[PDB]
Amino acid sequence: RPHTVYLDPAKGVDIPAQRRELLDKGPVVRVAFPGNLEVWALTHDAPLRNALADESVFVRGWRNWRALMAGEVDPTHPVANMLRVESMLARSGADHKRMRGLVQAAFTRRRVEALRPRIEEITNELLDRMAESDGVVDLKAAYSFPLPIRVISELLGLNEEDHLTLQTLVTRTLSGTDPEANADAFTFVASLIEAKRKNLDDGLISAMIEARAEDGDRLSETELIHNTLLLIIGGFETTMGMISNSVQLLLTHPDQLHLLRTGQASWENAIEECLRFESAVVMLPFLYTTRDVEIDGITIPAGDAVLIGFGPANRDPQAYDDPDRFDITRPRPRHLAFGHGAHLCLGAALARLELLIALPALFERFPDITLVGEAPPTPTVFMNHPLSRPVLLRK
Amino acid sequence: RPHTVYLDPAKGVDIPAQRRELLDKGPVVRVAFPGNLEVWALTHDAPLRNALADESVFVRGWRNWRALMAGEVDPTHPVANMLRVESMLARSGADHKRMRGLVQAAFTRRRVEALRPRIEEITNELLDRMAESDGVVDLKAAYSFPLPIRVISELLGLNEEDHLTLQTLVTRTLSGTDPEANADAFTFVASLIEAKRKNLDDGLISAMIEARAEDGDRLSETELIHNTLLLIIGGFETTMGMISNSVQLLLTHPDQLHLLRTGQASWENAIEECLRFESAVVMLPFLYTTRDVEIDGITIPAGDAVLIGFGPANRDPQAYDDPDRFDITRPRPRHLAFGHGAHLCLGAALARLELLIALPALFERFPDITLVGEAPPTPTVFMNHPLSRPVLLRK
Ligand code: HEM
Ligand code: HEM
Ligand SMILES: c1ccc(-c2c[nH]cn2)cc1
Ligand SMILES: c1ccc(-c2c[nH]cn2)cc1
């Protein structure tokens, strides 16, 4: 007989409140959206981590959602549609392993470490441009967005003319209020691929195209498009989010930033605590139960859809002492900001490198940077980062 | 019996299509929104102009909305709430003239003429910053937004720290999908006033504070807040919109732009044709009939709410031959982009000067400027301007 959390991003977004309520309403909660869409969420660290590692019980892939294939839910509802896709993240077992295996090389810790000089160069160029500006600056537009999109652009083989197009596209797909986002994103990326087949390069999209051409069985056309999409979705928006979130947190905890700036504390650990404390991905659709599952005296029936509550789990007092305190010296937090199990973030080492470069460089160039104005949230209950991040670079 | 036009901006906005449908469906049409709200719209030039000039028959102000108090529409509906306010634009008669009169001085021809040096200076500084950038630039973020908000900031006495806050706040109020936008905007502006009382200055907000202090009957506290909000709503968003829309139009009509650049056509007339052709305000809530009014053989009952269709009226073939063609040489269009009658845009001369400075200066500095990427629309059925306007300055 579960508690219910009613969500509507049109009536504002409040991630801190949402995280609190999802955690408070036991580990297993019902989440009701607009339309007549109600689903489950798992929101405490221990049950969530357990579910995320047990893919025979909690499977990926919309074909497993009973109510969806039984016409009880509208397939065009944005939330029902968001992970109604054919990429690796919406697969389990051999299909996941096949697809993830094809692209893993490009994202290994060691490959990512070879990207450091170029990431430093892109970071330093951005800082140079910021130094030419004089008064209030949107950190998101100047810094947080351009850095990760440039980095993933070079890895994937994207074109600079599409960077702003992609920013809009991804926001729409993650809004959970845009019925046509997936369809428009698919047609967009299909065109990218068809342009790229004409003019190959040494980027990952070209390599995946080349891999399909060599062996059609290795990767279908639908998988090529959807996996390209997934890499685009993941590739910049969350790192962008995290840069802004991290700067907000460090400047609102000036003592901790002081430790970082004087070499008395670890940037790496601080970034892990930022990931836990203000996780850019609050929750995502879905896990689907393969059988009846009982948690805390509540049974989730076989075939039901379950939101993955990374954000509430990251504030769980069972997992962390004093969870609602930001503390960069805390024992390296084993957080779920990058998820857990088979679908643990492909890009996790790349994001960690990006943040490790971007965050100290910013404060080195602009030691007296301050937060000004308001930073209203992106209107989505799925993601947690600001629409804008106004700063003053010089006192 | 009137036709009905169903609008839902969540399912994607298309102002060109929307204007065509509104115009085509005779001058008097019903417009239905999601939830429980259906209203009227006047969408041809001649009946609209006539309504707008006749304030004893078509009054402003939500207390005149019979259906509202008859509980026939959802109150808290964003569209019902948008002009549920106490500013000059939501009043008629003595109250309108009192409130409008307090601020008119600052917007007369002679006052606006003294703003020219500063507008040119702001324009030239923005162009200097753009010249230090390299590849694709968002013209909106670099030029179209910062110019008007800086200009109105100086006139009103706003703080640069709030500029980006205001951009979001205004977008929310004009979305017509945000129930909490007016309330949050009022709270925000009430704080502005409380800050401003401490430190008065030479700007219009201070003058309105000073006016209330000297004679409380000249201006209530509610009126002070709502009118400050109104001036902020009006003060930059539409000029910003018009800059981008005008650049789109001139670069997609390169022959006409050529004539302007060689002194074979008038910038002033071109700007009037931009205003007519891609009017930034498509329609707004609410004339309310003071009696039964018959137009085109259709009676609008007393007390009913009527959308003001500036944009469809501006494409009316009865008002202009070949309305759907952009033609900077046409006789100066007598358009409704600024409205008509007692509420004719207080800022109209300021907007015309801003555009007259901004548009030629842009093309003089960046003669080979080119449109690239996508420019998706702001998601509102009320306003007509892009979310982003990617350009290459020095292709
Ligand atoms: C830096 C570039 C990034 C890329 C290219 C990227 C890409 C991906 C991909 C492809 C997956 C799916 C993995 C699989 O199915 O095996 C994934 C999962 C995930 N990523 Fe990322 N990601 C990046 C950064 C981030 C960051 C900074 C965060 C969080 C702050 C994040 C959060 C997640 C989460 C939570 C999942 C698991 C989703 C789930 O279990 O349903 N990612 N990422
Ligand atoms: C191109 C730029 C602009 C456009 C297209 C525009 C359009 C309009 C329109 C259509 C109206 C009439 C609304 C109605 O009748 O319901 C109006 C009224 C108004 N506008 Fe603007 N406007 C612009 C710029 C500005 C500026 C720069 C200001 C500066 C404060 C401003 C302040 C006002 C005010 C205060 C009113 C209400 C006047 C009254 O109630 O008497 N506008 N504008
Ligand atoms: C849908 C698909 C992938 C993501 C993602 C992966 N990594 C970051 N974000 C978010 C939403
Ligand atoms: C609501 C109220 C006023 C406006 C306006 C007036 N002038 C510019 N914008 C827009 C929307």
- A388 to B168: CB separation less than 8 angstroms, yes or no: yes
Helix (H), strand (E) at residue B95: helix B94-104
Amino acid making up residue A300: I
Q: What is the DSSP string of B247-265?
A: HHHHHHSHHHHHHHHTTSS
Grouping H, G, I as helix, E, B as strand and the rest as coil, residue A266 is coil
- A132 to B132: CB separation less than 8 angstroms, yes or no: yes
Nearest ligand 4 atom to the CA of B345 is: 7
Those residues whose C-beta lies under 8 Å from the C-beta of residue A26, and which sit 6 or more positions away, are A2, A3, A43, A44, A296, A298
Contact B22, B43 (CB under 8 A): yes
Q: Which of A346, A354, A385 for mutating ligand 1's site (highest number of atoms within 8 Å of CB)?
A: A346
Q: In what order do the strands lie in the sheet with A305-308?
A: A4-6, A28-32, A38-42, A305-308, A284-289, A58-59
Dist CA B363 CA A204 (whole Å): 39
Dist CA B298 CA B187 (whole Å): 41
Instruction: Determine the straight-line distance between the first and last CA of chain B, rounded to whole angstroms.
Output: 54
| Residue B334 CB coordination number (10 Å) | 13
Tell me, in angstroms, the distance from the centre of ligand 1 to residue A231's CA: 8
- The bound ligand whose nearest atom lies closest to the alpha carbon of B90 is 2
Q: Which residues of A touch B180 (CB under 8 A)?
A: 11-12
By alpha-carbon position, which residue is closest to atom 7 of ligand 4?
Answer: B234
- The bound ligand whose nearest atom lies closest to the alpha carbon of A310 is 1
- A164 to B133: CB separation less than 8 angstroms, yes or no: no
The packing angle between helices B254-261 and B237-252, to 10°, is: 100
Cα of A290 vs its chain's centroid, Å: 25
Helix (H), strand (E) at residue B297: none
Q: Which residues of A touch B376 (CB under 8 A)?
A: 168
User: Residue B27 burial (CB < 10 Å; 0-12/13-18/19+)?
Assistant: buried
Closest Cβ–Cβ partner in B136, B160, B168 for A387: B168
Q: What is the DSSP string of A157-222?
A: T--GGGHHHHHHHHHHHHHS--TTHHHHHHHHHHHHHHHHHHS--SSHHHHHHHHHHH-TTTS-HH
Grouping H, G, I as helix, E, B as strand and the rest as coil, residue A59 is strand
**Residue from B90, B77, B58, B15 nearest B283 by CA:** B15
**Token pair 């995280």 is at which residue?**
A19
Q: Which of A86, A149, A230, A275 for mutating ligand 3's site (highest number of atoms within 8 Å of CB)?
A: A230
Contact B68, B80 (CB under 8 A): yes
Nearest ligand 2 atom to the CA of B310 is: 10
Amino acid making up residue A61: G
Q: Which residues of B touch A376 (CB under 8 A)?
A: 165, 168
**Residue from B44, B33, B93 nearest B64 by CA:** B93
| A149 Cβ below 6 A of ligand 1 | no
- The bound ligand whose nearest atom lies closest to the alpha carbon of A337 is 1
- The bound ligand whose nearest atom lies closest to the alpha carbon of B171 is 4
Q: What is the DSSP string of B201-229?
A: -SSHHHHHHHHHHH-TTT--HHHHHHHHH
Contact A123, A151 (CB under 8 A): no
What backbone phi and psi angles, to 5 degrees, belong to A371? -75, 135
For A129, how many CA atoms within 13 A lie in the half-sphere containing its CB?
22
Amino acid making up residue A354: E
Helices (H) and strands (E) counted in chain A, each on its own, are 18, 11
> What is the distance in angstroms between the Cα of A207 and the nearest Cα belonging to chain B?
25
Q: Which residues of B touch A11 (CB under 8 A)?
A: 179-180
CA angle B231, B235, B237 (to 5 degrees): 125
Residues of A with CB under 8 A from a CB of B: 10-12, 129, 132-133, 135-136, 138, 141, 160-165, 167-168, 177-180, 372-374, 376, 387-388, 390, 392
What backbone phi and psi angles, to 5 degrees, belong to B4? -125, 140
- The bound ligand whose nearest atom lies closest to the alpha carbon of A241 is 1
Dist CA A206 CA A225 (whole Å): 12
- A136 to B164: CB separation less than 8 angstroms, yes or no: yes
Dist CA B282 CA B348 (whole Å): 16
Grouping H, G, I as helix, E, B as strand and the rest as coil, residue B241 is helix
List the structure tokens of A281.
Answer: 């991905």
Closest Cβ–Cβ partner in A133, A160, A178 for B136: A160
Measured torsion, CA atoms of residues A54, A55, A60, A62, in degrees rounded to the nearest 10: -100
What backbone phi and psi angles, to 5 degrees, belong to B392? -110, 125
Cα of B42 vs its chain's centroid, Å: 17
List the structure tokens of B316.
Answer: 């009316």
Closest Cβ–Cβ partner in B163, B164, B388 for A164: B388
Domains of chain B: 4-392 (1.10.630.10)
Bridge partners of A59, per DSSP, are A288
Dist CA B89 CA B74 (whole Å): 22
Nearest ligand 3 atom to the CA of A238 is: 8
**Residue from B282, B276, B286, B277 nearest B309 by CA:** B282
Cα of A258 vs its chain's centroid, Å: 28
> What is the distance in angstroms between the Cα of A364 and the nearest Cα belonging to chain B?
22
Q: Which of A89, A175, A231 for mutating ligand 3's site (highest number of atoms within 8 Å of CB)?
A: A89
> What is the distance in angstroms between the Cα of A165 and the nearest Cα belonging to chain B?
6
- B180 to A12: CB separation less than 8 angstroms, yes or no: yes
Tell me, in angstroms, the distance from the centre of ligand 4 to residue B277's CA: 18
| Residue B54 CB coordination number (10 Å) | 15
Bridge partners of B5, per DSSP, are B31
Residues of the binding site of A? 60, 100, 345
Those residues whose C-beta lies under 8 Å from the C-beta of residue A114, and which sit 6 or more positions away, are none
Give the nearest chain B residue to A391 (CA atoms). B161
Bridge partners of A248, per DSSP, are none
Tell me, in angstroms, the distance from the centre of ligand 2 to residue B347's CA: 6
**Residue from A43, A47, A35 nearest A6 by CA:** A35
| A89 Cβ below 6 A of ligand 1 | yes
Dist CA A318 CA A314 (whole Å): 10
| Residue A134 CB coordination number (10 Å) | 11
Dist CA B179 CA A59 (whole Å): 38
Q: Which residues of B touch A10 (CB under 8 A)?
A: 177-179
List the structure tokens of A371.
Answer: 């937060």
Grouping H, G, I as helix, E, B as strand and the rest as coil, residue B370 is strand
Helix (H), strand (E) at residue B371: strand B370-371
**Residue from A250, A257, A248, A253 nearest A376 by CA:** A248
Residues of the binding site of A for heme b? 60, 100, 345
List the structure tokens of A195.
Answer: 């342009």
Mutate to test the interface with A, among B164, B184, B191 (most CBs of A within 10 A): B164
| A284 Cβ below 6 A of ligand 3 | yes
> What is the distance in angstroms between the Cα of B163 and the nearest Cα belonging to chain A?
8
By alpha-carbon position, which residue is closest to atom 12 of ligand 2?
Answer: B339
The Cα diameter of chain A in Å comes to: 60
DSSP state of A140: I
- Across B279-315, b (16+ Cβ under 10 Å) vs e yields bbbbbbbbbbbbeebebeeeebeebbbbbbbbbbbbb
Resolution (A): 2.0
Q: Which of B60, B81, B89 for mutating ligand 4's site (highest number of atoms within 8 Å of CB)?
A: B89
Contact B279, B9 (CB under 8 A): no
By alpha-carbon position, which residue is closest to atom 5 of ligand 4?
Answer: B234
Dist CA A363 CA A371 (whole Å): 13
Dist CA A23 CA A20 (whole Å): 5
Helix (H), strand (E) at residue A308: strand A305-308
- B161 to A129: CB separation less than 8 angstroms, yes or no: no
Tell me, in angstroms, the distance from the centre of ligand 4 to residue B364's CA: 30
Q: What is the DSSP string of A326-353?
A: --TTSS----STT--GGGS-TTHHHHHH
Dist CA B280 CA B309 (whole Å): 12
Nearest ligand 2 atom to the CA of B156 is: 30
